[PDB]
Structure 1
């Protein structure tokens, strides 16, 4: 584990408080792509120029063309990424990727099949998985494991900062930016290495800790826009907020938004509270209009689930650092 002295930062654009993306470049000359950095997965992929134009999502995004890259190295093994809300498919390729000033030869997937739903709703073109190889598909080495191999990063960690719509957000590779957090960092260890998940001692909504009273799992997901729990949990949680469930999310009468109780997550002894302003898309104060909440149900299957997921809703309030070296996660108040 060679630790050098370079600390890179990736500037992020905040789209609707639901998607945080930055730029990376693939090949020579660089072909730029807008991507999301997802601690929830470990592969890197962008749409391919070989993607049939019958996939409208491909027509609406930047396409990587191997024929315009002199640094390209063929491979072709098929790859399928099945995410919680959709799937992408294609084949593996290799070329040089530039992220935050760092140039690393990376193996990525050239997607030739990306469904209109949900990808048509994606501002970004691709995803850059920030997880461990244990979660990587096709056994492809994650892009961070490769940067750590170049022994240039001061520290074997990276930090995320999600702003709330100046810069939309920021990722620091090799450290954290003291500019975006105050107070001390409070860490927790991962249940097991290979996944960015930690034990969660309990969840309290309002005056009663009616949820996860006997402990539960908490996944810290930078690629997730909201916070999620088992359908069972969310129904309890939403029942308590007085919210009514729609097809894909929960809402409340906008006038009722500001009166919503606080919601806390007991992580590693420290209490992480969010007021209604932190999880309600207060777009109106009218009683005659619905306001959606940044929390919904999601039943992640084992070995990972059942489990909660703390996404942008949570990270917007707490600066998050991911420590690969000591397999822990640290939180601090974001400023």
Structure 2
């Protein structure tokens, strides 16, 4: 293990709204850049680098995409873990050091719809479960695959339709990152019912930060992700499958 000394953190006393009540986690440990730290508090990983508690200032995520799998995933501080990926890593420069933001070259539905046609900006966010894109472009996407709107930019797909959906490929660093329908759709469950949620949600993030696409857990689950603060880059390799 590791002990990061002299870490400034929040003792939460109010959490209005409902989203924290039934969440599985007690809290959040942010791993983006200091630029977006509330009150300019030096982040855990920055404090870790300054205390030289790892040799490589990088950190990596494997996230399992079978919900019943053990382990559920792994965060490797200061390294990458070969157990969880196949082949070699391909890297992209960070474009704005705030979020882990990268240039996205395009998004292509295999049946021909192209979004982000001339390139756009994306963030690589382990704390977002779904892929996120602008409302209008996601609406077109969802129409191309036959999904229907649910609520708050989410969409559902009949489960029996999934296996025949088109693949969706994101282009990053000039390489194609394919997502099969099984990759980009999720089982959801409530009160004994099972349904299939589309893994793309529509949300407009206003300027000056936005617009931004988000590469969430849908993406990171298929592509093991390395976050490199030494070289301000993000790496992807195909995850164990």
- The answer, yes or no, to whether TM exceeds 0.5 is yes
| Aligned residues of 1:253 and 1:289 also touching (Cα < 8 A) | no
What is the total number of aligned residue pairs between the two structures? 233
Aligned to 1:124: 25
User: Unpaired runs of 5+ in structure 1?
Assistant: 1-99
Aligned to 1:294: 199
Q: Deviations over 1:72-97 (max 9, x none)?
A: xxxxxxxxxxxxxxxxxxxxxxxxxx
What is the CA distance between 1:246 and its match in structure 2? Answer: 1.1
What is the CA distance between 1:210 and its match in structure 2? Answer: 1.8
Aligned to 1:53: none
Where 1:316 maps in the other structure, the secondary structure is helix
Measure the CA separation in 1 of the matches of 2:237 and 2:208.
Answer: 29
Measure the CA separation in 2 of the matches of 1:102 and 1:294.
Answer: 36
1:191 pairs with 2:92: no
Aligned to 2:179: 274
Q: Deviations over 1:203-233 (max 9, x none)?
A: 0012314211111111100110110001011
1:156 pairs with 2:60: no
Measure the CA separation in 2 of the matches of 1:172 and 1:250.
Answer: 33
User: Unpaired runs of 5+ in structure 2?
Assistant: none
What is the CA distance between 1:311 and its match in structure 2? Answer: 0.8
Measure the CA separation in 1 of the matches of 2:72 and 2:198.
Answer: 20
Aligned to 1:245: 149
What is the CA distance between 1:331 and its match in structure 2? Answer: 0.2
Q: Deviations over 1:19-42 (max 9, x none)?
A: xxxxxxxxxxxxxxxxxxxxxxxx
Where 2:235 maps in the other structure, the secondary structure is strand
> Which residue, 107, 110, 121 being the options, matches 1:217?
121
Structure 1 or 2, whichever has the larger Rg, is 1
Question: 1:87-126, aligned counterparts within 5 Å?
Answer: 100-126=1-27
Aligned to 1:256: 161
- Larger relative CO (CA 8 A, sep 6+): 1 or 2? 2
Q: CA RMSD in A?
A: 1.7
> Which residue, 34, 42, 48 being the options, matches 1:133?
34
Measure the CA separation in 2 of the matches of 1:123 and 1:185.
Answer: 31
| Aligned residues of 1:257 and 1:282 also touching (Cα < 8 A) | no
Measure the CA separation in 2 of the matches of 1:151 and 1:254.
Answer: 49
Measure the CA separation in 2 of the matches of 1:226 and 1:104.
Answer: 34
What is the CA distance between 1:289 and its match in structure 2? Answer: 7.4
| Aligned residues of 1:229 and 1:308 also touching (Cα < 8 A) | yes
| Aligned residues of 1:202 and 1:209 also touching (Cα < 8 A) | no
What is the CA distance between 1:194 and its match in structure 2? Answer: 2.8
Q: CA, structure 1 residues 120+240, in 2 after alignment: closer, same or farther (shift >3 Å)?
A: same
| Aligned residues of 1:161 and 1:319 also touching (Cα < 8 A) | yes
| Aligned residues of 1:227 and 1:311 also touching (Cα < 8 A) | yes
Give me the TM-score of the superposition, normalised by structure 1: 0.67
What is the CA distance between 1:192 and its match in structure 2? Answer: 2.1
What is the CA distance between 1:282 and its match in structure 2? Answer: 4.7
| Aligned residues of 1:180 and 1:319 also touching (Cα < 8 A) | yes
Measure the CA separation in 1 of the matches of 2:198 and 2:157.
Answer: 8
Aligned to 2:84: 180
1:324 pairs with 2:229: yes
Measure the CA separation in 1 of the matches of 2:141 and 2:156.
Answer: 13
| Aligned residues of 2:107 and 2:117 also touching (Cα < 8 A) | yes
Aligned to 1:315: 220
